[model samples]
Target: SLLSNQLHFAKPTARTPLVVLVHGLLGSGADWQPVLSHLARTQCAALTLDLPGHGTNPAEAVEMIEQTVQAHVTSEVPVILVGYSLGGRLIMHGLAQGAFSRLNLRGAIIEGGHFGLQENEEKAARWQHDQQWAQRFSQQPIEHVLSDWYQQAVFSSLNHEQRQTLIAQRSANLGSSVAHMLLATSLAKQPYLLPALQALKLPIHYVCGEQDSKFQQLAESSGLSYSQVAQAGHNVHHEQPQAFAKIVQAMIHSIID
Candidate 1:
């Protein structure tokens, strides 16, 4: 059932770890195609999936991470969960819950995702902001939405061509679905993964764009293995695909030996 939520699979010659990429709000599996294509050339089998309410995926009853993982992970093979923004938080929570130990979790790359919920005020402020954004998405059209979305510092690195490509990709998504995702997942269920980060048994890498100030601060302060790409923002992969691929490839290769 959940297998249908995924995209871009390369059949494995051997049962290698699955390179599963999950996109952020208003994004689909197609968003990760460029990265997935590069990854597929390596030993790992690559895949990218649409999260609930993001693309063709059916909306979940609520955005519970476990249910989401359980639905998608049918194989006992471990997965390298590569997540961006919203997907990153879900991957962290899933690993934190010991979901990976059962499977063959090789590693993780959390790209610009929320990790620590240090205080109540911060959480409250985030919830409130997300609620407002959700409301805004409901009222806005896709054209207006992408126009404003990229202007944010988080995506400022996106050049006109890349921004246009992203805009075209998301043009098909219904605003109501995007807003519902914000309500169901982003606004309602974001986790504070700091405590869990400490307890993570797998090798974890926190990657973010240099211009993504908030997540950059989070990554730096998290006391984990972290790296940043220049000339990129929150959506760093889009801005610097080759650089992103190189970093991830090196990480994977390092672990193999």
Candidate 2:
């Protein structure tokens, strides 16, 4: 079943293709405002939608990529899915699904997401940890949960000022909803899509911030094509919106030609 969703759009060119931007856990569509404006100016129509428990969406229903894509976007127009972290994980799942309603998904860009572990031992352990984390997240308070997330080494590139700004901006939701997301979709459901992803003919651009050493390493070890933004951390778009924009714009041009 599909979780409820709301999509907001900005049309820069009447004929431009739609680019769907999905946010990470606890984030809303408005979170991508900076990226949307740049993409819009580049003649790419933007579709920024909130997932269940985020933005104006009412419920915290647990859902996978298929349900998320289906619930919010069913247009015949081809889409370029740009996902970050949790969203990136979902986008990977969407690509592997092999079928979408009324749309031709030409490509996807995964930012700061794992491409799945190679060794079964590592994969099994991560999956197990993810399952437990999902449960733990749902039980914690949003701000309290966010406090720990913001303090992680992954977000070390964000200075005190930037971190404070982000927290203030995102301090609007219930922690449980965020928790539901982590357990149900973010952590508990990430699949080993390496083989399926490698076989996928669609264009894939894997991006990461240079400081997010773990994901950068994931990208390197994958043998798949990827790009890194200098001096940025986990949330590359928030840290370097222009670099993020340029990448998306380049992908647009590549598709055009």
Candidate 3:
């Protein structure tokens, strides 16, 4: 479950908690490297993992957030979960489904994650949208699909250089494997998680880049505690690693203290 090139440290303080990092679609645990570098001087420990279909993880036996968390993390230590996009979505499901009930889950941080469609009409539309994307990923060359994928409205802040960098970095992904992950965890099938996230007894926070208008609106309308990162896009951790790390450090202290 956990990736090899990850960030972890023996706690510098007794109150410091363990942090679990989960990355988004077309990404592996290494995406957190920049953020981890910023956390290097901090007291807390962290673990990052490759989601199924990305990095070394096999898509054939993909495990959802519940199983991943339960399998990789220990119950005795206080834990904080930080997820980006798809990773965030699965974390939301685990929280709502009571899959993490066994862990000493202190808090959760969701970045640019969807809360699911409230109506069947919207779900129907999203299902088609996701299916189309899945088909493209399964059929087209990964580079071509990625080139188009980065042009989505949510990634409006990405300049030409950034888009090209992502395309090059993510080209190793197999179309078929990515397609399996896309269809299986599509937002179309997720339940409305806002009510449950709001009702949750443990602390939770929604984070989004200021430039990502879509998720910014989602965080605001959901009425959940949230923070907006300035001058960043959907992937705040990648665009502004230091700022994201600062936010994470603050959240960890707030929950652990």
What ordering of candidates by TM-score runs from best to worst? Answer: 3, 1, 2
- Per-residue alpha-carbon lDDT of model 3 for 63-125, expressed as tens digits? 344455555456666788899999898888888877778878889999998999989999899
- Winner by lDDT: 3
Q: How does model 3 fare in lDDT?
A: 0.83
Question: lDDT tens digits, residues 28-136, model 2?
Answer: 7787888766665676666666776778553133134445554544465457889888778777776666644345676788998776555767766766776665555
Each prediction's whole-model lDDT (CA): 0.71, 0.71, 0.83
Q: Lowest lDDT 10-mer window, candidate 3? A: 57-66
- What does candidate 1's lDDT look like per residue over 1-257, in tens digits? 45335534454322555666777887877777667656665666666667767666542322343344445455565567788888887788767666555555668898998874667787788788778777777887778877777677777667788778878877788887788877766533556667777776678999989988888898898988888888878987677777777777876675553
TM-score of model 3 vs. true structure: 0.92
TM-score of each: 0.85, 0.84, 0.92
Q: How many Å off is the CA of 76 in candidate 2? A: 5.9
